[PDB]
Structure formats: structure tokens, C-alpha cells
Amino acid sequence: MISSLWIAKTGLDAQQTNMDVIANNLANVSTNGFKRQRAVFEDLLYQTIRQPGAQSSEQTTLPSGLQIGTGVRPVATERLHSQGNLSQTNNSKDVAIKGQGFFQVMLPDGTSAYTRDGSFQVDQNGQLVTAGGFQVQPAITIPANALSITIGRDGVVSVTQQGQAAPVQVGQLNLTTFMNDTGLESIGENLYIETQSSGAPNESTPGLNGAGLLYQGYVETSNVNVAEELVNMIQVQRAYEINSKAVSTTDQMLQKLTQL
Amino acid sequence: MISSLWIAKTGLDAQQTNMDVIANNLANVSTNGFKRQRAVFEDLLYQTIRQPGAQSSEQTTLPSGLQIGTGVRPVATERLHSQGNLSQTNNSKDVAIKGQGFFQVMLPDGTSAYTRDGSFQVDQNGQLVTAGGFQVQPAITIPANALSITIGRDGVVSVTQQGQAAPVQVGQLNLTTFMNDTGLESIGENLYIETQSSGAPNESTPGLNGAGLLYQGYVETSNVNVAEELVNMIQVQRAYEINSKAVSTTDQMLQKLTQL
Amino acid sequence: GKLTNGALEASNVDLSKELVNMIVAQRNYQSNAQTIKTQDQILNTLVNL
Amino acid sequence: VKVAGITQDFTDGTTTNTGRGLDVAISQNGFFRLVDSNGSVFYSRNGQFK
Amino acid sequence: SFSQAVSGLNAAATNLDVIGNNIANSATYGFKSGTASFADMFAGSKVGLG
């Protein structure tokens, strides 16, 4: 019931959220196309007993007033849309993009989400779907009796057939670029939904208008730096212990107050 | 509230500064032309309860009065301008200085800074600049169609033109010296500037007035002895813990006193 | 430069320098980690008190 | 300590007589000029040609 | 930071497999020698990726 107690509670909550985001980053270190998050903290309002620069006299004004903080709160957890390392998998339908852009995916309920993890497959109808049953937006269909699937530098997916001696242009695979990539609202299963903070998507072919380039047989690993999370955990643990010490000091002070 | 507590607090602060300079030395152990730091402390004032040598009686004097110290303060933190080991990079645009002296650099604002690390590059316009876009004060300009750049022990520089098989001179690299090398004001990006503590800079051709020579293809490593940092760190940790123990003892005495 | 047909250029990367640089880098990294550990230990000792 | 940028050492490498006909090497400074599909212009030194 | 080392291991293994295939396919009359070709990669800047 004292101000210091609420301040220390806010500090403990901030440290707990920081530890939560660190643990979440460490958990999915080996999730393809994952982007790490970092939390930014902001202080609360200030109680002013004496206003700074107040007209304390006819001529003299206080250089600095009396202001007491009220704690700290987390304001946002921003994603770091950097470029992850590319790996080799030597699979026909594993595509990794370099640069910027997102594959579009048709959700079952009729809306559309966006994904960065390129690891596709084929369903029983030949549609080029993602891992999870969701199908891509341009709806590329792979015919049966196909021998090989080739994806060029740009998004022209072609299929080599047994009795044609020449690949047949099955379809085009574009991608959409947002101008507020950090603003996308993420949901489960490596999908992002367009929101107000993120701009309107504008689909374009890869390699043009700032879009990325497609590579077949590659996968983009998460951009999680393991060697820094240990140091962050040490720092977070120390801060949490310090704030707990502050709470204990306040409690002992109050107890000595009420023992008389 | 207790003089012992303040004295122990000053001791803790001094040990913290010592540990900080140790960490700073170890962090840039691979920085070229870096000079390690060393902190020097001194005792604070003394409260004289009984003046030493006081006239105790008509003919008797106190051999030594009662004096109480009040802590320790870090009087200074100075560079140790030794000569770092010379490496072998076999590059044509990095010069190591043997002896004393600094290269002069024109800062963007208009003043003059001094550097010890020689590892030069060429800007888009042909000027010889240090890593960071700062050009050399005498304004050495490398012409185009340059086959090789040669720098002798003296500051003379030559460039082998494509034809005429005759090298030409395009400038000279003089070195500046100071009366007090430890008084230079260090700033970021591995630079120094002149202050009142150091003397007025004097220019000199290499090999004259005690100025060092120039070696092309070599670079100067930091004079940080990693062997001594470990033992200094152990000593720092021990002293810090001992001062913390002193603070704990004083707090125990106060807590016991307040229980009356 | 003067063209030379029927030849290719190497990578001008020397293994001998790279291995010793790797050893030195590992030692420096370990020293910095030791400094981190020491600072954390003194902070913990202060916390307990 | 702040990293002040990496740099690439442009010392000439050791030329090896691979053979073939569609392969060239440069003994001094110089870059082959290539173009992309977008029209952008790049510069390289790899001799492999086909 | 294992990605670069893993890529280097894969490249070296591919080169060794090519060499082994070439040496094994000797005395095969209608056979042409093979040769591997590598290429550096750079996603952003200031750091390589294998």
C-alpha cells in the first residue's frame, strides 16, 4: 500500500515479460523463417510535488522540481525482420526467398494470410499447398505423371513431362511486399494477417519493385542469435533479483514501521 | 549515516572503476593502434581529532596525533603509450609507425585530430583517407591509373605510373609529436585531440627530432597484455568482495544497535 | 589488366593464416566471456550481502 | 569496441591453367561487366564462361 | 554460426564425390570428365553466408 511497492511490482512485471520473450526466442530457434522479437520498455507517469521552473519567488525559480516516478511498463514487442541464413535441403518443393516479400496463403474461412516459411507440398488434388493444408493464393496445380518441378530465379514454375521434350509453364508465383513489415499481426502456424498498421499489400513478381529472389532447394532458418540470449538471460536474472531485493527492503521497512 | 559506510562505499566505487577499465582493455584487445589504460587512486582528506606534534605540555609533544581517513578517490586514468608489436599484412595501404608520433587527420567540422593507427583507403575522389572517411591533413591524393603505391621510411610517397617507367612523388607523410603524450584527449573512432595538458604539437619528417620511421605493409597491434588482465581481474574481484564484506559488517553493527 | 586465355584465378585464401587467426579469436572470445562471468559473480556477491 | 566495417583484400590470386576455351583470367586490376534481367549492371572476375 | 561451416562441409563433400566419380568412371569410353563449381553467397552486407 506504499508507492515503492507498486513501483517494484511494475519492475518485476517488466523483467518477467523480458524473460518471457527471451524464452520464446530460444524455444523456436530451429523454426524455418522465424523472426525474433525484442521488447521496449517505457516509464509511467510522474507525480509532481514541486513543478520544475516554478515561480518560487519574484525573481528566483527552482532549477529542478520534485518529481517521483511511478514505475515502468512494456510498450511494444517489435519483430526484427532481418534476413536469416539460407540452408541446403535438395528438395524439389522447398523455396527460400532472399530479400523482402511474403507468400500469400488462402485461409479456409476465405481470408488470406501471409507467410515467409517456404516449404511446400502437394495435396490429393494437385494443388501446391503449404505444410498445414493451406493452399497458396495463385493456386498453382501440379499435374500427375510429372517428372520434375523447376522454379526459376523469378516465380515461373514449370514441370518437365515424359512425352513433351520441353517443360510446360504451369504457372506464376508472385509475392506481396508490405511497407510496414514490423507492423504485421502474427497468428499461429507462421502466418501473418494484414492489419491497419501494416500497409496495403501490392503483389509483384520476385526481383522487381524491391521484391526478393526465389531459390529452389533452400530454406531460410530463424534469425535467432544463440550466443546473445545467454548474456540476456544473465542480465534479466540479475535485474529480477535486484527488484526482489527492493521489495524485501520495502517490506522490512514497513514491518519496522508497524511494530511500534 | 556512519563514516565507515561512506568509506566502504568509496572503496566499492574505486574497485568498480578498476574493473571497468580492465573490461575496456580486454574488449578491444584486437584494435589496431590501441593503448591500454591504467587507473591511479589517492587517499581522501583526514579528520584530525588530535593534531600530531601538538604541544601536550611545557616540554612534551605528541609523537603522532589522532587522524582518521575518509576514503579513496580515483585521481586519474592514464594511457600507457608503449610500442605495440608490428604485424605483417602485406598490404600496400597500411603503414605502421615505429617510435613516436601521430598521423594528423582533418575532422569534418574543421579541426585537427591525431591518430596512431595507419590503415588507409582511397575515397571515391582519389583522396587518401583513414577508415571512416577522415582525410589526411597534408591532403595526399592518389592519381588514377596507379600500378603501385610505395612509401619509404621517410614520409615520401611515390606512385608507379603505367608508362615512362619512372616513379613520381605525390606528397609526404609527416608525423606530429607532443611534449606530453599522456595528456591527449581521446575520442571515439580511435582518435585523439590536443588539450592544454599536452603540449603544442610540432610537425617533423620521420627520422628527425626523435620521430619514428614508417614501415609499409605492417600494422601495429594493441599493447594489451592479456596475461596481466586475468590476474588483475582476480585481484579486483577479491578486493570488491572484501569491501562488500566491510559494508555488511557495518550494517550488522547498525542493526544490532537499533535493537535496543 | 592483361587477359590470359585458358586459365582461372584462385581464391587467394591461405589456410595457415586462417587457422592461427581462428585460434587467437577463440582465445580472445574466451577471455571476454571470463570477464562477463567475473562481473556477474561480483554482482551476485553484492546482491547476497 | 565497435566494428568499423569489413574490407575485401583485392590481391591478385594464383592463375591456374584449367584448359578449355571459354575461360579467361586477368593479371591486374579490372572487372568483367555483366547485366541482369532487370537491367542492373554488375562486375565480376570469375572466368567461367558458357 | 554453424551455417557457413556446414555449407563449406557440403561443398567439400560434393567436390570429393565429383572427384571419386571421375576417378571411378575411368576406362569408360563414352565418358566426359566432370568438374564442380562453387560460388560465394551474400544475403545482406558485411558478412558472408557460405
Structural descriptors:
part of a larger assembly, 5 chains, A: 260 residues, alpha+beta, three-stranded antiparallel beta sheet, 22% helix, C: 49 residues, mainly alpha, Flagellar hook protein FlgE (chain D), Flagellar_FlgE/F/G (chains A, B), Flagellar basal-body rod protein FlgG (chains A, B)
Protein described:
This is part of a larger assembly, with 2 copies of chain A (260 residues) and 3 copies of chain C. Chain A has helices at residues 3-27, 226-258; strands at residues 37-43, 46-50, 66-69, 72-79, 86-88, 95-98, 103-106, 112-115, 120-122, 128-130, 135-136, 146-151, 156-161, 168-172, 175-177, 185-187, 191-193, 202-204, 213-216, 218-220. With 260 residues, chain A is of the alpha+beta class. Chain A has a 3-stranded antiparallel beta sheet, with no helix packed on it. A 3-stranded antiparallel beta sheet of chain A has the order 12-13-14, with no helix packed on it. In chain A, strand 9 and strand 10 form a beta hairpin. In chain A, helix 1 (3-27) runs antiparallel to helix 2. Chain A is elongated and about 95 Å long. Chain A starts with a helix and ends with a helix. By secondary structure, chain C is mainly alpha-helical. Chain C has one helix at residues 15-48, and strands spanning 3-5, 8-9. Chain C is rod-shaped, with a radius of gyration of 23 Å. At the C-D interface, strand 1 and strand 2 of C face strand 1 and strand 2 of D. Strand 2 (8-9) of chain C pairs antiparallel with strand 1 of chain D. Chain E: It comes from Salmonella typhimurium (strain LT2 / SGSC1412 / ATCC 700720). Chain E: It is found in: Bacterial flagellum basal body. Chain E: This is Flagellar hook protein FlgE.
